[PDB]
Design an enzyme around this catalytic site. Structure first.
Site, PDB file in Angstrom:
ATOM      1  CG  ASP A   1       0.847  -3.505  -0.646  1.00 11.81           C
ATOM      2  OD1 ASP A   1      -0.360  -3.283  -0.407  1.00 11.81           O
ATOM      3  OD2 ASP A   1       1.274  -4.558  -1.141  1.00 11.81           O
TER       4      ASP A   1
ATOM      5  CG  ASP B   1      -1.980  -8.951   1.671  1.00 12.42           C
ATOM      6  OD1 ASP B   1      -1.719  -9.839   2.507  1.00 12.42           O
ATOM      7  OD2 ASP B   1      -2.995  -8.226   1.744  1.00 12.42           O
TER       8      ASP B   1
HETATM    9 MG   LIG Z   1       0.405  -6.189  -2.394  1.00 12.16          MG
END
Ligand SMILES: [Mg+2]
Ligand SMILES: [Mg+2]
Ligand SMILES: [Mg+2]
Ligand SMILES: [Mg+2]
Lengths: 250, 250, 250, 250
Positions: free
Chosen positions: B9, B11
């Site tokens: 992932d 962010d």
């Molecule tokens: Mg995230």
């Protein structure tokens, strides 16, 4: 690759209650004759594999106990891989035995999990204790989201309702539409999603779960869902047949 | 088998906004050096792979455009395999271009799909048309369920809210926590779930999706979720680290 | 005592869109001839009393501007009695003028209230600001809960949807089914609930509100609700008629 | 006019459980000495007026049985004015006796209403029957929406949860925040809303209901709600005090 494994839903596909759907026997025997791993799936936790085999045999369909996979078995398989082996259980029969075989201690003293299945003995006390434990941090697991079984008989989802209302928390439902149970079924067959098809009658459970899990899907119209239900559907079945009798892409 | 592929992932894991998380560069380079297929995932549909590569490079992290996979790309991949190539789109930029490349015609005349992503031009007219089409049977698809981006900036989920309210229907969200996007990511790497790990900072999206998809999961504490959030969690991460800097099980 | 005041819903009772319901004129004139205070209520905030009088006159029904009471007027009356006179408004026309007459300053700088009515200019920016202010503590008020007007035209409820999703807060809806607007209507007539009847076509709004407010209720079948809808209804109308044409208990 | 009648909530205002709030006795005696009609309100249906008087007396506060008004009494008053006198009841004690006095026949054979209060005997069978009747058109009424009583003890709202889930229908809750119970209380005192004040500790129930009913409201901070809770509140109390001890606007 091609279809090498098969997950087939039970109710509305192979059985109507205690009566077999015409062609079910031939459909299943054809799959087993080809040597394709087979799993007969059901979201309900009340029956053991033997109970299901007996129900099928009574209806004229003969299959091994081993092919059945219920939300109770799936829940036990889910918990087997978890740390902590103490649980307060709101349920009876099959689920209880499966948990004991998974090494669990069932207690209302410092439980790690609160597990809800189905039990006609469900009462104020159980709702109270379950809510108390969940509110206090117990891991909340439930076998299936269905609100009722036949007629308006309360099912797992209905038993969870009061517990969720009081605790303000929702459980992790192991059964369909959750894709995890499909993963569990694949592991049972040691199969890959790319070579497995799931046959079901409910677009919102069998099909949705299969699709999310990466499986090819076949919708039969012998149960809950109807053909016009696919028009507005975000995703659609790989194939659609009136019943298992015409399925020949396997 | 072992970890052979990695979905990571963006962010709260590799980036804080436009600033890289300490150790991100070394973490990613280590994976690529080993030759493990890598996908950098984000639930947001606004940026193209090149935009993301530029954002990363500006922050001091160098990776190929090809490793990025957004909910816009995933949505296009989802629709590519669908019948019907006419859609009314509530969105802009990246998503639009991806749809055109997927062979779509974007129109407000007899659309097969209503697709909602993100657009700061969202208005009464778009909500009206989208609601009208969905209410009339159009297939309702949305890139991601997030209600807002940075601060209180409306995101896809917020744009869908009015459409759902008027039409009485909910869209199929392509992004996390939906397990399908993980399947799409695996297909992008031609990888199997059993040999793939997903690294994320949100228990309710990265971890939940990975778990349901059958992946090993690693939760980093550099973002949304905190360590105490796993105590009551039904399922838990395979591993947990403060940040990607200490991940060494890959 | 007996019926001495009358609150009569507009749409589906006196008007079908821009066409009067047969008997509406005679019904209203009969009430005014008897000298009974009368309020013509509508949950929609777009029209001024004069607009409504003109709409009625165009349809052949003549009544004073003064008898009309909309959710915009009710919202202004609600806010008049409140401390703080700064509001960020998501709406246009009638509501705006009513607020100015109530002594309000409309601003996007430190507003005390976030007020949502209806505006075809609704956009991403308005949703953003409204969500930001509500999330930051602004008092969240909305004219009516209806999700759409004619067809699938977004209405107040739909405009609030995105704001609620982002902020995690719900507004106080001034209009039906909220009993408060009935109280406001009574105050407008300086009437008591025990001597007031409300005539409406929607069981879930006109009737529910009237009942909770302590009013006698009359359901007409010329609009939304149908006769069979009362069978399972917790509470039921004091009287039921096909339309206002047969009402003679006033 | 001025305050001539008083509705005062019990829990968190006059009592903490079985212990009186300092000043409660003097507060109540002052009201009765002035000859102002008084109603002591509680959303819970388990106690009779005598039970409540005894509870108060045990705590050192002496008041007549007649001043108490519970959601059970309010429910009976609601049903008295209804057609049909057959009901399937999920509850025990006070509510049952009140219904019998209202002329009801309690049966699981063709009931007109399904009434849910509170009962520690609640079980699978009751949920099943209630759901069956509601699904089949029975009028669904519930005493109060509260999900739990003390601690995590299931309350009416929790008992309704399963029934609502199975039937797909929601009940009409007689108690707060519903404005109707305030109307019922006023009728009990033969009082008008304009000359009645309600004292309560919960902004979302006592205050919200009083406000919608047109009553002046007084929030005490001795219970559920805290002072900072009014900042973002759409509407606010007429007055706010730490406890009833300082109330002197009556
Ligand atoms: Mg995230
Ligand atoms: Mg089925
Ligand atoms: Mg109407
Ligand atoms: Mg209280």
């Amino acid at each position: 690759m091609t279809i090498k494994n098969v997950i087939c839903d039970i109710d509305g596909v192979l059985m109507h209650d205690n009566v077999a759907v015409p062609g079910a026997a031939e459909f299943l025997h054809g799959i087993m004759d080809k040597g394709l791993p087979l799993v007969l799936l059901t979201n309900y936790p009340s029956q053991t594999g033997q109970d299901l085999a007996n129900r099928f045999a009574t209806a004229g369909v003969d299959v091994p106990d081993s092919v059945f996979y219920t939300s109770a078995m799936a829940t036990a398989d889910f918990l087997r891989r978890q740390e902590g082996k103490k649980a307060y259980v709101v349920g009876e029969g099959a689920l209880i035995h499966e948990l004991y075989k998974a090494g669990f201690t069932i207690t209302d003293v410092n439980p790690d999990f609160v597990i809800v299945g189905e039990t006609r003995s469900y009462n104020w006390d159980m709702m109270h204790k379950a809510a108390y434990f969940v509110a206090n941090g117990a891991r909340f697991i439930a076998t299936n989201p269905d609100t009722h079984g036949r007629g308006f008989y309360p099912a797992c989802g209905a038993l969870c309702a009061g517990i969720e209302k009081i605790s303000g928390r929702k459980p992790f439902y192991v059964g369909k539409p959750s894709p995890w149970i499909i993963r569990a079924a694949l592991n049972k067959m040691q199969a890959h999603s790319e070579e497995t098809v799931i046959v079901g009658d409910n677009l919102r459970t069998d099909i949705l779960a299969g699709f999310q899990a990466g499986l090819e899907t076949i919708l039969v119209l012998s149960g809950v869902s109807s053909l016009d239900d696919i028009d507005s559907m975000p995703f659609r079945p790989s194939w659609i047949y009136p019943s298992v009798a015409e399925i020949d892409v396997i």
